[PDB]
Amino acid sequence: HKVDQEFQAAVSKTSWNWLLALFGGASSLIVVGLIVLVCSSMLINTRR
Amino acid sequence: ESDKTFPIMLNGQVNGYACVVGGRLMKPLHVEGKIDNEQLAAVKLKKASMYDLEYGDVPQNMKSDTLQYTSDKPPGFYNWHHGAVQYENGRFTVPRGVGGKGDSGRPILDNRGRVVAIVLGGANEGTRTALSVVTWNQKGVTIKDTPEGSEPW
Amino acid sequence: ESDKTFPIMLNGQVNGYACVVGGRLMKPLHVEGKIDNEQLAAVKLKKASMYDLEYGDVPQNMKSDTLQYTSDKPPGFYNWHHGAVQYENGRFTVPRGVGGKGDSGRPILDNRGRVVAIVLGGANEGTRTALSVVTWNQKGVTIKDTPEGSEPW
C-alpha cells in the first residue's frame, strides 16, 4: 500500500453526513433547551 | 380564617399555616412539618421552589368552602389574624413587634372575606415591619414581594 | 317554568324536562323518553351529541310563547324550581341535597323571568353540589361548565 490510511480522510461523506446529522441533532437540541430556559427566565423577569 | 386555616406540626409544635384558596392548597416550602388534617396528608404537593411554595389539588369535599381569591388592592388597612395590616406604596407592613417565626403562610383576608396575600416572612426597619409576601396582579401574575433584608418566618 | 317546561316520560316515570327557548325546543341526550306534548312529537330533533342535546324548530303557533335566553350573567343568586342557585367564579352550585336524577333540562331562571342556563347534571361535594350545565356567552357562544366528578342526572 503506497499511502498510509488516516482517520480524517478514511470515512465516506455519506457516513460523515449521517454521523454529523446525528450529533448535531443533540447539539442543537441542548442549545435550543438552553435558549428556551433563558427566554422563560427573561419572560418571568419582564412580566414579574 | 380559623375554620379553613390549618396548623402544621413540627415535633408537636406550630410552625406555619397551610391555606386553601380556590380549590388549591398552598403551603410555604421553607417551613417543614406535617399538615394536621389527615385528608390533606394524602394530597400530592407540586413545588414552586423559586416561589418558596408548594401547591396541591384539594379533595372534593372542601374545594367550594375555600378562601375566595381577589386581585383588586387599593391602599389602606386590610384584615389579618393578628389585627390590621397597612398596604401602602405597594408594600405590606405591620407594627414593629407583632408577628414572627411560625406565622409563615398566614392568609391576609379582605373586608368581604377574600384573600389578598399570604405572608412568608418579615423584616424589621425599626419603625415598622415590612412583610415579604406574595401579591397578585391584574394580569394574573403572582409576584413574590420581598423587601430588602427579608427573613422567612 | 310550569307553563313552558314539559317532562319526558318513560314507562310512566319522569326522567327529564324539555325546554322551549328562543323559539326552538331543546332536550338532553343522556335521558331517553317520550316528550309529553303531542304537537312537538313531530319535530325532527337534530342532535348535537358533543353538546349532549337535541334541538328542533317549534311550529308557528307556539313560537310566540317561549322562554327567553340571556347573555348577561350578573354573579349572585338565580331562580330555579328547587330554590336559589348560586353563581360565582364562572361556576354554578346549589345547597347540598337539592336536586337529583330526573331534573335534567330544567332551566335556571333569573329575576326578570328569563333563562340563563339549562341543568344537565350535578356532583355532590358535601358542602354544596356543583351543577354541570350549559351556559351562554357575550359573543353568542354556548359553553359547557362541567366540573370534575360530574354525573349526568
Curated annotation (Swiss-Prot), chain A:
Q: Which domain of life is it from?
A: Viruses
Q: Which residues lie on this side of the membrane: Cytoplasmic?
A: 39-48
| Entry's localization field | Virion membrane; Host cell membrane
Q: Where are the transmembrane segments?
A: 18-38
As for membrane topology, the entry says:
Single-pass type I membrane protein
Q: How is it modified after translation?
A: N-glycosylated.
Residues folding into a coiled coil are none
Question: How does this chain assemble?
Answer: Interacts with spike glycoprotein E2. The precursor of protein E3/E2 and E1 form a heterodimer shortly after synthesis. Processing of the precursor of protein E3/E2 into E2 and E3 results in a heterodimer of the spike glycoproteins E2 and E1. Spike at virion surface are constituted of three E2-E1 heterodimers. After target cell attachment and endocytosis, E1 change conformation to form homotrimers. Interacts with 6K protein.
Q: What does this protein do?
A: Class II viral fusion protein. Fusion activity is inactive as long as E1 is bound to E2 in mature virion. After virus attachment to target cell receptor PCDH10 and endocytosis, acidification of the endosome induce dissociation of E1/E2 heterodimer and concomitant trimerization of the E1 subunits. This E1 trimer is fusion active, and promotes release of viral nucleocapsid in cytoplasm after endosome and viral membrane fusion. Efficient fusion requires the presence of cholesterol and sphingolipid in the target membrane.
The protein, known as: Spike glycoprotein E1
Organism per entry: Western equine encephalitis virus
Could you say which residues of the full protein are shown? 1189 to 1236 of 1236
From Swiss-Prot, chains B, C:
Looking at the record's lineage, which domain of life comes first? Viruses
Write out the domain note.
The very N-terminus plays a role in the particle assembly process. The N-terminus also contains a nuclear localization signal and a supraphysiological nuclear export signal (supraNES), which is an unusually strong NES that mediates host CRM1 binding in the absence of RanGTP and thus can bind CRM1, not only in the nucleus, but also in the cytoplasm. The C-terminus functions as a protease during translation to cleave itself from the translating structural polyprotein.
How does it get modified after it is made? Phosphorylated on serine and threonine residues.
Question: Which part of the complete protein is shown?
Answer: 107 to 259 of 1236
The residues responsible for catalysis, as annotated, are H30, D52, S104
Would you tell me the protein name for this molecule? Capsid protein
Q: Where in the cell is it found?
A: Virion; Host cytoplasm; Host cell membrane; Host nucleus
Give the site residues for Involved in dimerization of the capsid protein.
Y78, N111
Q: Where is this region: Interaction with spike glycoprotein E2?
A: 46-51, 138-142
Cite the Peptidase S3 domain residue spans from the record: 4-153
Q: Which residues carry this modification: Phosphothreonine?
A: T5
Could you give the subunit structure recorded for this chain?
Homodimer. Homomultimer. Interacts with host karyopherin KPNA4; this interaction allows the nuclear import of the viral capsid protein. Interacts with spike glycoprotein E2. Interacts with host IRAK1; the interaction leads to inhibition of IRAK1-dependent signaling. Part of a tetrameric complex composed of host CRM1, host importin alpha/beta dimer and the viral capsid; this complex blocks the receptor-mediated transport through the nuclear pore. Interacts with host phosphatase PPP1CA; this interaction dephosphorylates the capsid protein, which increases its ability to bind to the viral genome.
Annotated function: Forms an icosahedral capsid with a T=4 symmetry composed of 240 copies of the capsid protein surrounded by a lipid membrane through which penetrate 80 spikes composed of trimers of E1-E2 heterodimers. The capsid protein binds to the viral RNA genome at a site adjacent to a ribosome binding site for viral genome translation following genome release. Possesses a protease activity that results in its autocatalytic cleavage from the nascent structural protein.
Q: Modified residue Phosphoserine is at which positions?
A: S2
